[PDB]
Amino acid sequence: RPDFCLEPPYTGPCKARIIRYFYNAKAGLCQTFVYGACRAKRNNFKSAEDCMRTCGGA
């Protein structure tokens, strides 16, 4: 499994408020978090299927 999914999400600066998905190593799967719409990282999937299809595998 990748390590960018174990890290926390990145709301980043900006002022937008989108509900992106990220892998919660504490939950074992993915959850939704506030995205800044800019400077997104690997811990910011548009859908839970993209987050699980990327780091999913527990």
Swiss-Prot record:
Residues of the full protein shown: 36 to 93 of 100
Organism: Bos taurus (Bovine)
Gene Ontology BP term (one): negative regulation of thrombin-activated receptor signaling pathway
Compartment(s): Secreted
Domain of life, per lineage: Eukaryota
Residue span, BPTI/Kunitz inhibitor domain: 5-55
The protein's name: Pancreatic trypsin inhibitor
Keywords: Disulfide bond, Pharmaceutical, Protease inhibitor, Secreted, Serine protease inhibitor, Signal
Main subcellular localisation: secreted
Site residues by UniProt (Reactive bond for trypsin): K15, A16
GO CC field: extracellular space; serine protease inhibitor complex
Covalent S-S links between cysteines: C5-C55, C14-C38, C30-C51
GO MF annotation terms: calcium ion binding; molecular function inhibitor activity; potassium channel inhibitor activity; protease binding; serine-type endopeptidase inhibitor activity; sulfate binding; zymogen binding
Summary of the function given for this chain in its UniProt record: Inhibits trypsin, kallikrein, chymotrypsin, and plasmin.
Keyword match Disulfide bond: yes
Lineage of producing organism: Eukaryota, Metazoa, Chordata, Craniata, Vertebrata
